[PDB]
Design a protein around this nucleic acid. Structure first.
Ligand code: MG
Ligand code: MG
Ligand code: MG
Ligand code: MG
Ligand code: MG
Ligand code: MG
Ligand code: MG
Ligand code: MG
Ligand code: MG
Ligand code: MG
Ligand code: MG
Ligand code: MG
Ligand code: MG
Ligand code: MG
Ligand code: MG
Ligand code: MG
Ligand code: MG
Ligand code: MG
Ligand code: MG
Ligand code: MG
Ligand code: MG
Ligand code: MG
Ligand code: MG
Ligand code: MG
Ligand code: MG
Ligand code: MG
Ligand code: MG
Ligand code: MG
Ligand code: MG
Ligand code: MG
Ligand code: MG
Ligand code: MG
Ligand code: MG
Ligand code: MG
Ligand code: MG
Ligand code: MG
Ligand code: MG
Ligand code: MG
Ligand code: MG
Ligand code: MG
Ligand code: MG
Ligand code: MG
Ligand code: MG
Ligand code: MG
Ligand code: MG
Ligand code: MG
Ligand code: MG
Ligand code: MG
Ligand code: MG
Ligand code: MG
Ligand code: MG
Ligand code: MG
Ligand code: MG
Ligand code: MG
Ligand code: MG
Ligand code: MG
Ligand code: MG
Ligand code: MG
Ligand code: MG
Ligand code: MG
Ligand code: MG
Ligand code: MG
Ligand code: MG
Ligand code: MG
Ligand code: MG
Ligand code: MG
Ligand code: MG
Ligand code: MG
Ligand code: MG
Lengths: 137, 159, 204
RNA sequence: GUGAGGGCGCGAGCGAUAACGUCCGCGUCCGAGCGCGGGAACAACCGAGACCGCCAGCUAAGGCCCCCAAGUCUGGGCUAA
RNA sequence: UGUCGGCUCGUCGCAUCCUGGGGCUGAAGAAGGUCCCAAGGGUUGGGCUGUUCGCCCAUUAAAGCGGCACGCGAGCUGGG
RNA sequence: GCUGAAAGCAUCUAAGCGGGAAGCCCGCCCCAAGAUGAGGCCUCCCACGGCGUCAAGCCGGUAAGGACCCGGGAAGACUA
């Protein structure tokens, strides 16, 4: 009768950012947000790592994406569809790019939201130096 | 390549000379081979995409060297009755036909001069900087397609 | 960026040279700076102006401690002028000289639950040739199965007025330091005896 | 009982070498398999015919970067949109 | 699943009527022709007819076209 | 339009740069921390008093403060 895991403890990570490809980074990242790397994994629980990214401003991306890759954002209003090119995002709040890229790869349920909080994104590097900062790659 | 001072970095290249010095960002996947009294460039292949990048860095640097070798500059002919330039301080002010007489800023690295109201040269260390500022002035009043007025280069009239 | 609190007293008219000029009398009464707002520890620049004196009977609130931490006479009302760091004391109508121009904020008169007729200056329907139960009504508000809903923003009858209103580029005609009076070109929100802030414009 | 059939492939007429059009022929699936996997979703397209149970196992189509099981697999090309 | 027109309220497209920008011109200038970019906002009042449409009067920067069950009758009208 | 190769020349382009619209982003006026990703600054109040050992709770008294009620208001359907 399959093993159900008990109360674990958060394992904070610290991913870099500079150089890494937007998409390819996100992929790995989420698979940490979900515990899916840890054998003691279970769907209903939610116990993936506390991922922490730094220098997201230095995310690279292939091709003309800097210009072409537009984000949409529909305010409820008429004509309210407001679009925004990748450039403009990185210009302004940059972590924003990496944030959604990941969000869009997390499951769509409530804990999927719970999982999103687990991710701390930045551009510095330097976070609030809590405790665990186990660098990764 | 005499009295020149070439150098190398990840992507760019320096070129020092009597005139000064300039950054010359160049192809990354290209060789900036420096020799004794000469330089050079070598491409990693023979692709259609490679060829184009070679020659560019080839010329690009050579003009960089030439820039501090002597420095570039260009003419400017002011045709038309009223039209006439006047070097005020460092900057060029020139009348032409607008009720307000246009005044032109003196950009850094460039120095223009009015040897005569019907002449304006533009001396500079950068072939690029030279090029724009040249046209900038011509732009102030293109040649009259129906006469012979306003700025001109050393190229034929429009007629 | 000048700024100063006041109260709308009422309005009449004066004659410039030989041509009459309608004017509202703001009263930019003495305002003691009660706290400065710097990026160092606030994140932004501005100045907490105080306005109108107060009997310590209501100020029972530890506000007394706020006024104390700046040695000021406990006022009744205080709001911030943004990006405006004066000198360490008190602003007057004096910040404004005649000929200057000012933007002015106030709380418009409260028109309560408004008819779309007035709230949005609609046009309703015929006083005559029929229907008679739709005179001051809005008429259609959408279309058939598609879209099948109503736009977030649709002008419909509701609370109108008593909102915040800024009116732009009024000229400061006169300024009587004697009794703290600002003289502007009339059109200023709020009713008499109402509170109102006044500041430099954006002609440039 | 049935004598409304329907879609798809193919072969013709009609049609305009239109139609989720129509009318026959051969086949097929839905009808009655709106049960199961694939195709995002979807009677009839691909896979397959559910007697019930199992916290076993191989595979079908399809698929193996994350949502989402399983290769960011290996080798040789091409494409810069 | 109430059908034309009007009225009220609109909103979206752009194959752009006007204002903005631009190439060409059989563009001297002024004015215009034509194509390209460009919805932000604007796009009048009356006569005739149920009218839509259209003709006409007087103006305009212009008096655009079209989608929204030829938008809109649990909103209105009810001339057809 | 500059500089410029493939492609000895030439080319505004392929590397790169400048110019360029009522348009895009900001700037202007309004809303806005239910921005659950609930922000921030100034000031004020401050222990247990009683069951719960262990644990988060529970109880009557409290503080700064607030509320009810009443007199009203260019606030207002009511409430706020
Ligand atoms: Mg590093
Ligand atoms: Mg760019
Ligand atoms: Mg749209
Ligand atoms: Mg807008
Ligand atoms: Mg930090
Ligand atoms: Mg020399
Ligand atoms: Mg020279
Ligand atoms: Mg010279
Ligand atoms: Mg010289
Ligand atoms: Mg206080
Ligand atoms: Mg403000
Ligand atoms: Mg500001
Ligand atoms: Mg003062
Ligand atoms: Mg009637
Ligand atoms: Mg009747
Ligand atoms: Mg009636
Ligand atoms: Mg009736
Ligand atoms: Mg009735
Ligand atoms: Mg209806
Ligand atoms: Mg709908
Ligand atoms: Mg004085
Ligand atoms: Mg006095
Ligand atoms: Mg039959
Ligand atoms: Mg049949
Ligand atoms: Mg059959
Ligand atoms: Mg059949
Ligand atoms: Mg057919
Ligand atoms: Mg069968
Ligand atoms: Mg199904
Ligand atoms: Mg389908
Ligand atoms: Mg079926
Ligand atoms: Mg099926
Ligand atoms: Mg197997
Ligand atoms: Mg297989
Ligand atoms: Mg297979
Ligand atoms: Mg391969
Ligand atoms: Mg391969
Ligand atoms: Mg177009
Ligand atoms: Mg046309
Ligand atoms: Mg135009
Ligand atoms: Mg002309
Ligand atoms: Mg033209
Ligand atoms: Mg008739
Ligand atoms: Mg008309
Ligand atoms: Mg319309
Ligand atoms: Mg129709
Ligand atoms: Mg139709
Ligand atoms: Mg209709
Ligand atoms: Mg009716
Ligand atoms: Mg009707
Ligand atoms: Mg109707
Ligand atoms: Mg009747
Ligand atoms: Mg009749
Ligand atoms: Mg009738
Ligand atoms: Mg030229
Ligand atoms: Mg060249
Ligand atoms: Mg060739
Ligand atoms: Mg050449
Ligand atoms: Mg380029
Ligand atoms: Mg610039
Ligand atoms: Mg530019
Ligand atoms: Mg506000
Ligand atoms: Mg607030
Ligand atoms: Mg956010
Ligand atoms: Mg005590
Ligand atoms: Mg104790
Ligand atoms: Mg106890
Ligand atoms: Mg009361
Ligand atoms: Mg009351």
């Amino acid at each position: 009768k399959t093993y159900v895991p008990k109360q674990v403890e958060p394992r904070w990570v610290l991913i870099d950012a500079e150089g890494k490809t937007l998409g390819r980074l996100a992929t790995k990242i989420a698979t940490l947000l979900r515990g899916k790397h840890r054998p003691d994994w279970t769907p209903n629980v939610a116990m993936g790592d506390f991922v922490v990214v730094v220098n997201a401003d230095k995310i690279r991306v292939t091709g003309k994406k800097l210009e072409q890759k537009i984000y949409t954002r529909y305010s409820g209003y008429p004509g309210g569809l407001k679009k925004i090119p990748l450039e403009k995002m990185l210009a302004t709040h940059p972590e924003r790019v990496l944030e959604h890229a990941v969000k869009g790869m997390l499951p769509k349920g409530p804990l999927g939201r719970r999982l999103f909080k687990r991710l701390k994104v930045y551009a510095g590097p330097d976070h609030p130096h809590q405790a665990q900062r186990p660098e990764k790659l | 390549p005499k009295g020149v001072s070439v150098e190398v970095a990840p992507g760019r290249v320096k070129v020092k000379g009597p005139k000064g010095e300039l950054e010359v960002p160049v192809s990354p996947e290209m060789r900036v081979v420096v020799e004794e009294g000469v330089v050079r460039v070598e491409r990693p292949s023979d692709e259609r995409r490679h060829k184009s990048l070679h020659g560019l860095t080839r010329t690009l640097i050579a003009n960089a060297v030439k820039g501090v070798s002597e420095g570039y500059s260009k003419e400017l002919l002011i045709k038309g009755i009223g039209y006439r330039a006047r070097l005020v301080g460092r900057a060029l002010e020139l009348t032409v036909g607008f009720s307000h007489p246009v005044v032109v800023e003196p950009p850094e690295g460039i120095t223009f001069e009015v040897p005569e109201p019907t002449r304006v040269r533009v001396s500079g260390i950068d072939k690029q900087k030279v090029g724009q500022v040249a046209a900038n002035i011509r732009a102030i009043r293109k040649p009259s397609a129906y006469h012979e007025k306003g700025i001109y280069y050393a190229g034929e009239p429009v007629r | 960026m000048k700024g100063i609190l006041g109260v709308k007293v009422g309005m009449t008219r004066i004659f410039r040279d030989d041509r009459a000029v309608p004017v509202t009398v703001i009263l930019a009464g003495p305002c003691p700076v009660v706290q400065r707002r710097t990026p160092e520890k606030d994140g932004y620049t501005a100045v907490q102006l105080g306005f109108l004196p107060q009997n310590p009977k209501r100020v029972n609130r530890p506000l007394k401690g706020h006024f104390a931490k700046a040695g000021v006479e406990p006022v009744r009302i205080l709001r911030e002028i943004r990006d405006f760091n004066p000198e360490g004391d008190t602003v007057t109508v004096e910040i404004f000289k005649p000929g200057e121009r000012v933007d002015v904020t106030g709380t418009s008169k409260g028109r309560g639950f408004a008819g779309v007729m007035k709230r949005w200056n609609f046009a309703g329907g015929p006083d005559s040739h029929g229907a008679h139960k739709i005179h001051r009504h809005p008429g259609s508000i959408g279309n058939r199965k598609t879209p099948g809903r109503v736009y977030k923003g649709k002008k419909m009858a509701g609370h109108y007025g008593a909102e915040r209103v800024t009116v732009m580029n009024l000229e400061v005609v006169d300024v009587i330091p004697e009794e703290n009076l600002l003289l502007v070109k009339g059109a200023v929100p709020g009713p008499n005896g109402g509170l109102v802030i006044v500041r430099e414009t954006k002609k440039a």
